[PDB]
Amino acid sequence: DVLAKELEDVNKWGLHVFRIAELSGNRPLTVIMHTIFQERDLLKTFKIPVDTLITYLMTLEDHYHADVAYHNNIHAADVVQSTHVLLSTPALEAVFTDLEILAAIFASAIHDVDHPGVSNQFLINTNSELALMYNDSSVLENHHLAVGFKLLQEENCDIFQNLTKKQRQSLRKMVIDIVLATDMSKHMNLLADLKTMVETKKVTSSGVLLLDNYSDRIQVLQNMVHCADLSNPTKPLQLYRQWTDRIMEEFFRQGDRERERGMEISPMCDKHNASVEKSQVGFIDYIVHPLWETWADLVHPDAQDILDTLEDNREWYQSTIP
Ligand SMILES: Oc1ccc2cc(-c3ccc(OC(F)F)c(OCC4CC4)c3)oc2c1
Ligand SMILES: [Mg+2]
Ligand SMILES: [Zn+2]
Protein backbone atom coordinates (compact mmCIF):
# COMPACT_ATOMS: atom_id res chain seq x y z
CA ASP A 1 0.00 0.00 0.00
CA VAL A 2 2.98 2.28 0.65
CA LEU A 3 4.48 1.43 -2.76
CA ALA A 4 1.04 1.48 -4.38
CA LYS A 5 0.34 4.90 -2.92
CA GLU A 6 3.64 6.14 -4.41
CA LEU A 7 2.78 4.63 -7.80
CA GLU A 8 -0.24 6.91 -7.92
CA ASP A 9 2.33 9.62 -8.86
CA VAL A 10 3.16 7.86 -12.14
CA ASN A 11 1.69 10.61 -14.35
CA LYS A 12 3.62 13.34 -12.50
CA TRP A 13 7.00 14.92 -13.13
CA GLY A 14 9.09 14.38 -10.03
CA LEU A 15 7.84 10.93 -9.06
CA HIS A 16 9.87 9.70 -6.07
CA VAL A 17 11.69 7.09 -8.12
CA PHE A 18 14.30 6.36 -5.44
CA ARG A 19 11.59 5.59 -2.86
CA ILE A 20 9.85 3.36 -5.39
CA ALA A 21 13.12 1.50 -6.00
CA GLU A 22 13.45 0.77 -2.27
CA LEU A 23 9.74 0.16 -1.65
CA SER A 24 9.63 -2.32 -4.55
CA GLY A 25 12.71 -4.30 -3.56
CA ASN A 26 15.11 -2.82 -6.14
CA ARG A 27 12.47 -3.43 -8.79
CA PRO A 28 11.64 0.15 -9.93
CA LEU A 29 11.69 -0.71 -13.67
CA THR A 30 9.30 -3.68 -13.41
CA VAL A 31 6.68 -1.97 -11.25
CA ILE A 32 6.80 1.39 -13.06
CA MET A 33 6.56 -0.32 -16.46
CA HIS A 34 3.78 -2.60 -15.24
CA THR A 35 1.86 0.39 -13.83
CA ILE A 36 2.25 2.43 -17.02
CA PHE A 37 1.22 -0.48 -19.25
CA GLN A 38 -1.89 -0.81 -17.07
CA GLU A 39 -2.55 2.95 -17.14
CA ARG A 40 -2.27 3.09 -20.96
CA ASP A 41 -4.30 -0.19 -21.36
CA LEU A 42 -1.41 -1.64 -23.40
CA LEU A 43 -1.86 -5.21 -22.12
CA LYS A 44 -5.34 -5.35 -23.65
CA THR A 45 -4.51 -3.39 -26.80
CA PHE A 46 -1.65 -5.72 -27.72
CA LYS A 47 -2.93 -8.90 -26.03
CA ILE A 48 0.14 -8.99 -23.77
CA PRO A 49 -0.11 -11.78 -21.15
CA VAL A 50 0.43 -10.26 -17.72
CA ASP A 51 2.76 -13.10 -16.68
CA THR A 52 4.78 -12.65 -19.87
CA LEU A 53 5.17 -8.93 -19.16
CA ILE A 54 6.42 -9.48 -15.60
CA THR A 55 8.84 -12.21 -16.64
CA TYR A 56 10.34 -10.08 -19.38
CA LEU A 57 10.48 -6.95 -17.20
CA MET A 58 12.24 -8.86 -14.40
CA THR A 59 14.77 -10.38 -16.82
CA LEU A 60 15.36 -7.01 -18.47
CA GLU A 61 15.79 -5.38 -15.06
CA ASP A 62 18.20 -8.18 -14.10
CA HIS A 63 20.52 -7.20 -16.98
CA TYR A 64 21.03 -3.67 -15.61
CA HIS A 65 24.09 -3.58 -13.37
CA ALA A 66 23.28 -3.22 -9.67
CA ASP A 67 26.91 -2.18 -8.96
CA VAL A 68 26.93 0.77 -11.37
CA ALA A 69 26.09 4.07 -9.67
CA TYR A 70 24.11 5.88 -12.40
CA HIS A 71 23.44 3.69 -15.47
CA ASN A 72 21.39 1.12 -13.55
CA ASN A 73 17.77 -0.02 -13.37
CA ILE A 74 16.73 3.15 -11.45
CA HIS A 75 17.88 5.36 -14.35
CA ALA A 76 15.96 3.09 -16.74
CA ALA A 77 12.75 3.40 -14.72
CA ASP A 78 13.24 7.16 -14.47
CA VAL A 79 13.57 7.50 -18.26
CA VAL A 80 10.52 5.27 -18.89
CA GLN A 81 8.42 7.32 -16.48
CA SER A 82 9.71 10.64 -17.83
CA THR A 83 8.97 9.49 -21.40
CA HIS A 84 5.50 8.43 -20.22
CA VAL A 85 4.76 11.97 -18.96
CA LEU A 86 6.09 13.65 -22.12
CA LEU A 87 3.86 11.40 -24.26
CA SER A 88 0.79 12.77 -22.47
CA THR A 89 1.52 16.41 -23.28
CA PRO A 90 -1.51 18.34 -24.65
CA ALA A 91 0.33 19.32 -27.85
CA LEU A 92 0.61 15.59 -28.71
CA GLU A 93 -2.93 14.37 -27.89
CA ALA A 94 -4.06 11.71 -30.41
CA VAL A 95 -0.88 12.20 -32.47
CA PHE A 96 0.89 8.87 -31.97
CA THR A 97 -0.61 5.43 -32.54
CA ASP A 98 -0.68 2.76 -29.85
CA LEU A 99 2.29 1.07 -31.60
CA GLU A 100 4.41 4.24 -31.54
CA ILE A 101 3.61 4.79 -27.85
CA LEU A 102 4.54 1.15 -27.21
CA ALA A 103 7.81 1.62 -29.12
CA ALA A 104 8.73 4.79 -27.27
CA ILE A 105 8.12 3.24 -23.84
CA PHE A 106 9.86 -0.04 -24.67
CA ALA A 107 12.86 1.83 -26.16
CA SER A 108 13.13 3.88 -22.94
CA ALA A 109 13.09 0.73 -20.78
CA ILE A 110 15.90 -1.04 -22.72
CA HIS A 111 17.88 2.03 -23.77
CA ASP A 112 20.88 1.48 -21.38
CA VAL A 113 20.56 -2.24 -20.53
CA ASP A 114 23.81 -4.07 -19.58
CA HIS A 115 25.60 -0.69 -19.33
CA PRO A 116 29.04 -1.27 -17.74
CA GLY A 117 29.32 2.21 -16.24
CA VAL A 118 31.97 3.49 -18.69
CA SER A 119 31.54 5.63 -21.81
CA ASN A 120 31.82 4.75 -25.51
CA GLN A 121 35.10 6.63 -25.81
CA PHE A 122 36.57 4.62 -22.94
CA LEU A 123 35.45 1.39 -24.57
CA ILE A 124 37.07 2.54 -27.82
CA ASN A 125 40.32 3.69 -26.15
CA THR A 126 40.76 0.42 -24.25
CA ASN A 127 40.38 -1.90 -27.27
CA SER A 128 37.29 -3.44 -25.67
CA GLU A 129 35.47 -6.40 -27.16
CA LEU A 130 32.36 -4.19 -27.40
CA ALA A 131 34.14 -1.62 -29.52
CA LEU A 132 35.63 -4.41 -31.65
CA MET A 133 32.18 -5.92 -32.24
CA TYR A 134 30.59 -2.62 -33.21
CA ASN A 135 33.49 -0.93 -35.08
CA ASP A 136 33.61 2.07 -32.70
CA SER A 137 30.17 3.39 -33.80
CA SER A 138 27.36 3.78 -31.22
CA VAL A 139 29.05 0.87 -29.41
CA LEU A 140 26.93 0.90 -26.25
CA GLU A 141 23.67 1.84 -27.95
CA ASN A 142 23.92 -1.01 -30.46
CA HIS A 143 24.64 -3.29 -27.50
CA HIS A 144 21.68 -2.15 -25.36
CA LEU A 145 19.41 -2.84 -28.34
CA ALA A 146 20.82 -6.29 -29.08
CA VAL A 147 20.40 -7.25 -25.40
CA GLY A 148 16.91 -5.77 -25.10
CA PHE A 149 15.63 -7.66 -28.16
CA LYS A 150 17.54 -10.88 -27.42
CA LEU A 151 15.90 -11.21 -23.99
CA LEU A 152 12.45 -11.31 -25.66
CA GLN A 153 13.45 -14.78 -26.83
CA GLU A 154 13.89 -16.18 -23.31
CA GLU A 155 11.28 -18.48 -21.77
CA ASN A 156 7.88 -16.73 -21.61
CA CYS A 157 9.47 -13.37 -22.43
CA ASP A 158 8.03 -12.45 -25.84
CA ILE A 159 5.73 -9.62 -24.81
CA PHE A 160 5.16 -8.92 -28.54
CA GLN A 161 3.88 -12.45 -29.31
CA ASN A 162 0.38 -11.28 -30.37
CA LEU A 163 1.36 -8.36 -32.62
CA THR A 164 0.96 -8.86 -36.35
CA LYS A 165 4.10 -9.56 -38.38
CA LYS A 166 3.86 -6.04 -39.78
CA GLN A 167 3.40 -4.51 -36.31
CA ARG A 168 6.51 -6.29 -35.00
CA GLN A 169 8.57 -5.20 -38.04
CA SER A 170 7.51 -1.58 -37.63
CA LEU A 171 7.98 -1.65 -33.86
CA ARG A 172 11.45 -3.20 -34.23
CA LYS A 173 12.58 -0.44 -36.63
CA MET A 174 11.20 2.40 -34.48
CA VAL A 175 12.88 1.07 -31.34
CA ILE A 176 16.24 0.84 -33.12
CA ASP A 177 15.87 4.36 -34.53
CA ILE A 178 15.01 5.67 -31.06
CA VAL A 179 17.79 4.02 -29.06
CA LEU A 180 20.61 4.77 -31.54
CA ALA A 181 19.53 8.41 -31.19
CA THR A 182 20.38 8.33 -27.45
CA ASP A 183 24.02 8.08 -28.49
CA MET A 184 25.33 11.25 -26.82
CA SER A 185 27.78 11.88 -29.60
CA LYS A 186 24.66 12.50 -31.79
CA HIS A 187 23.20 15.23 -29.54
CA MET A 188 24.19 18.29 -31.59
CA ASN A 189 22.86 16.89 -34.87
CA LEU A 190 19.66 15.76 -33.19
CA LEU A 191 19.13 19.18 -31.61
CA ALA A 192 19.96 21.03 -34.86
CA ASP A 193 17.26 18.97 -36.58
CA LEU A 194 14.83 19.67 -33.73
CA LYS A 195 15.34 23.43 -34.11
CA THR A 196 14.52 23.09 -37.81
CA MET A 197 11.21 21.34 -37.06
CA VAL A 198 10.26 23.95 -34.45
CA GLU A 199 10.95 26.72 -36.96
CA THR A 200 8.73 25.02 -39.57
CA LYS A 201 6.17 23.15 -37.44
CA LYS A 202 2.47 22.92 -38.25
CA VAL A 203 -0.57 22.49 -36.00
CA THR A 204 -4.02 21.08 -36.78
CA SER A 205 -7.51 22.56 -36.36
CA SER A 206 -7.61 21.14 -32.80
CA GLY A 207 -4.26 22.72 -31.84
CA VAL A 208 -2.12 19.58 -31.96
CA LEU A 209 1.24 18.95 -33.63
CA LEU A 210 0.90 17.80 -37.25
CA LEU A 211 3.25 14.90 -38.09
CA ASP A 212 2.29 13.36 -41.44
CA ASN A 213 5.34 11.26 -42.32
CA TYR A 214 7.54 8.67 -40.64
CA SER A 215 10.58 10.96 -40.71
CA ASP A 216 8.91 13.68 -38.62
CA ARG A 217 7.20 11.24 -36.28
CA ILE A 218 10.34 9.25 -35.49
CA GLN A 219 12.32 12.47 -35.07
CA VAL A 220 9.92 13.72 -32.36
CA LEU A 221 10.09 10.35 -30.57
CA GLN A 222 13.90 10.34 -30.87
CA ASN A 223 14.08 13.76 -29.22
CA MET A 224 11.41 12.88 -26.66
CA VAL A 225 13.43 9.94 -25.32
CA HIS A 226 16.70 11.90 -25.56
CA CYS A 227 14.98 14.63 -23.48
CA ALA A 228 13.86 12.10 -20.85
CA ASP A 229 17.43 10.76 -20.83
CA LEU A 230 18.68 14.31 -20.14
CA SER A 231 15.88 15.23 -17.72
CA ASN A 232 17.68 14.99 -14.34
CA PRO A 233 18.34 18.78 -14.02
CA THR A 234 14.65 19.45 -14.76
CA LYS A 235 13.52 17.44 -11.73
CA PRO A 236 12.78 18.78 -8.20
CA LEU A 237 16.11 19.61 -6.59
CA GLN A 238 16.30 16.69 -4.16
CA LEU A 239 15.99 14.26 -7.09
CA TYR A 240 18.47 16.20 -9.25
CA ARG A 241 21.16 16.24 -6.54
CA GLN A 242 21.04 12.48 -6.05
CA TRP A 243 21.35 11.95 -9.82
CA THR A 244 24.44 14.22 -9.77
CA ASP A 245 25.92 12.27 -6.86
CA ARG A 246 25.49 9.06 -8.85
CA ILE A 247 26.84 10.31 -12.20
CA MET A 248 29.93 11.80 -10.53
CA GLU A 249 30.71 8.57 -8.69
CA GLU A 250 30.45 6.70 -12.00
CA PHE A 251 32.62 9.31 -13.75
CA PHE A 252 35.21 9.24 -10.93
CA ARG A 253 35.50 5.46 -11.08
CA GLN A 254 36.10 5.65 -14.85
CA GLY A 255 38.80 8.27 -14.26
CA ASP A 256 40.45 6.06 -11.65
CA ARG A 257 40.74 3.38 -14.33
CA GLU A 258 42.11 5.90 -16.84
CA ARG A 259 44.58 6.81 -14.07
CA GLU A 260 45.65 3.22 -13.33
CA ARG A 261 46.40 2.81 -17.06
CA GLY A 262 48.42 5.94 -17.88
CA MET A 263 45.70 7.42 -20.09
CA GLU A 264 44.65 11.05 -20.12
CA ILE A 265 41.72 11.35 -17.72
CA SER A 266 38.46 12.23 -19.49
CA PRO A 267 36.79 15.60 -18.79
CA MET A 268 35.13 15.78 -15.34
CA CYS A 269 36.35 12.27 -14.37
CA ASP A 270 39.36 13.21 -12.18
CA LYS A 271 38.35 13.31 -8.50
CA HIS A 272 41.42 15.45 -7.63
CA ASN A 273 40.49 18.26 -10.03
CA ALA A 274 36.70 18.22 -10.41
CA SER A 275 34.41 21.18 -9.69
CA VAL A 276 31.05 19.44 -9.43
CA GLU A 277 28.92 22.58 -9.18
CA LYS A 278 30.61 24.42 -12.07
CA SER A 279 30.26 21.36 -14.27
CA GLN A 280 26.54 21.02 -13.61
CA VAL A 281 26.20 24.70 -14.56
CA GLY A 282 28.04 24.14 -17.84
CA PHE A 283 26.11 20.92 -18.44
CA ILE A 284 22.79 22.82 -18.24
CA ASP A 285 24.03 25.86 -20.18
CA TYR A 286 25.54 23.97 -23.10
CA ILE A 287 23.48 20.72 -23.33
CA VAL A 288 20.38 20.41 -21.18
CA HIS A 289 18.87 23.89 -21.45
CA PRO A 290 19.38 24.28 -25.25
CA LEU A 291 17.61 20.93 -25.73
CA TRP A 292 14.76 21.50 -23.26
CA GLU A 293 14.17 25.06 -24.46
CA THR A 294 13.74 23.70 -27.98
CA TRP A 295 11.44 20.89 -26.80
CA ALA A 296 9.43 23.44 -24.79
CA ASP A 297 9.16 25.49 -28.01
CA LEU A 298 7.84 22.44 -29.88
CA VAL A 299 5.05 21.82 -27.34
CA HIS A 300 4.57 25.41 -26.07
CA PRO A 301 3.39 26.10 -23.39
CA ASP A 302 2.96 22.52 -22.08
CA ALA A 303 6.55 22.31 -20.79
CA GLN A 304 6.83 25.74 -19.12
CA ASP A 305 6.98 24.38 -15.54
CA ILE A 306 9.63 21.82 -16.47
CA LEU A 307 11.73 24.60 -18.00
CA ASP A 308 11.22 26.88 -14.94
CA THR A 309 12.50 24.11 -12.67
CA LEU A 310 15.55 23.69 -14.89
CA GLU A 311 16.27 27.41 -14.67
CA ASP A 312 15.75 27.38 -10.88
CA ASN A 313 18.05 24.36 -10.49
CA ARG A 314 20.62 26.15 -12.67
CA GLU A 315 20.41 29.25 -10.49
CA TRP A 316 20.81 27.14 -7.37
CA TYR A 317 23.96 25.30 -8.52
CA GLN A 318 25.36 28.63 -9.75
CA SER A 319 24.68 30.23 -6.33
CA THR A 320 27.02 27.69 -4.65
CA ILE A 321 30.19 28.75 -6.52
CA PRO A 322 30.84 32.39 -5.35
O1 LIG B 1 28.76 9.80 -22.81
C1 LIG B 1 27.68 10.01 -21.99
C2 LIG B 1 26.49 9.31 -22.19
C3 LIG B 1 25.41 9.51 -21.34
C4 LIG B 1 25.50 10.42 -20.29
C5 LIG B 1 24.61 10.96 -19.30
C6 LIG B 1 25.27 11.94 -18.65
C7 LIG B 1 24.95 12.82 -17.53
C8 LIG B 1 23.78 12.63 -16.78
C9 LIG B 1 23.54 13.39 -15.65
C10 LIG B 1 24.44 14.37 -15.27
O2 LIG B 1 24.31 15.22 -14.19
C11 LIG B 1 23.25 15.19 -13.35
F1 LIG B 1 22.21 15.60 -14.13
F2 LIG B 1 23.05 13.97 -12.80
C12 LIG B 1 25.60 14.58 -16.03
O3 LIG B 1 26.42 15.59 -15.62
C13 LIG B 1 27.77 15.26 -15.28
C14 LIG B 1 28.68 16.16 -16.08
C15 LIG B 1 29.87 16.74 -15.42
C16 LIG B 1 28.73 17.62 -15.76
C17 LIG B 1 25.85 13.80 -17.14
O4 LIG B 1 26.57 12.06 -19.14
C18 LIG B 1 26.69 11.12 -20.14
C19 LIG B 1 27.79 10.93 -20.95
MG1 LIG C 1 22.93 5.54 -23.01
ZN1 LIG D 1 20.52 6.82 -20.43
Numbering used by the authors: 90 to 411
Sentences from the paper on this structure:
Phosphodiesterase‐4 (PDE4) is a member of the phosphodiesterase family and is involved in important physiological regulatory functions through the hydrolysis of cAMP. 41 There are four subtypes of PDE4: PDE4A, PDE4B, PDE4C, and PDE4D. PDE4 plays an important role in the hydrolysis of cAMP, its inhibition of PDE4 leads to an increase in intracellular cAMP levels. We further found cAMP‐specific 3′,5′‐cyclic phosphodiesterase 4D (PDE4D) as an essential therapeutic target for liver metastases of CRC and interfering the function of PDE4D could repress colorectal cancer metastases.
Based on these previous studies, we designed and synthesised a new series of 2‐arylbenzofurans as potent PDE4 inhibitors. The most potent inhibitor, L11, exhibited a potent affinity of 54 nM, which was better than that of other compounds. Given the potent inhibition of L11, the cocrystal structure of PDE4 with bound L11 was obtained at 2.1 Å resolution. The liganded PDE4 crystals had the space group P212121 with unit cell dimensions of a = 58.36, b = 80.43 and c = 164.58 Å, and the structure was refined to R/R free = .227/.278. The 2Fo–Fc electron density unambiguously revealed the binding of L11 to the PDE4 pocket. The scaffold of L11 formed two H‐bonds with the conserved Gln369 and π−π stacking interactions with a hydrophobic clamp consisting of Phe372 and Phe340/Ile336. In addition, the 6‐hydroxybenzofuran fragment of L11 formed an H‐bond with residue Asn209, mediated by a water molecule, which differs from the binding pattern of roflumilast. Further structural superposition of the crystal structures of PDE4‐Roflumilast and PDE4‐L11 also revealed that L11 has a slightly different binding pattern. L11 did not induce emetic effects in dogs at this dose, indicating that L11 is well‐tolerated in dogs.
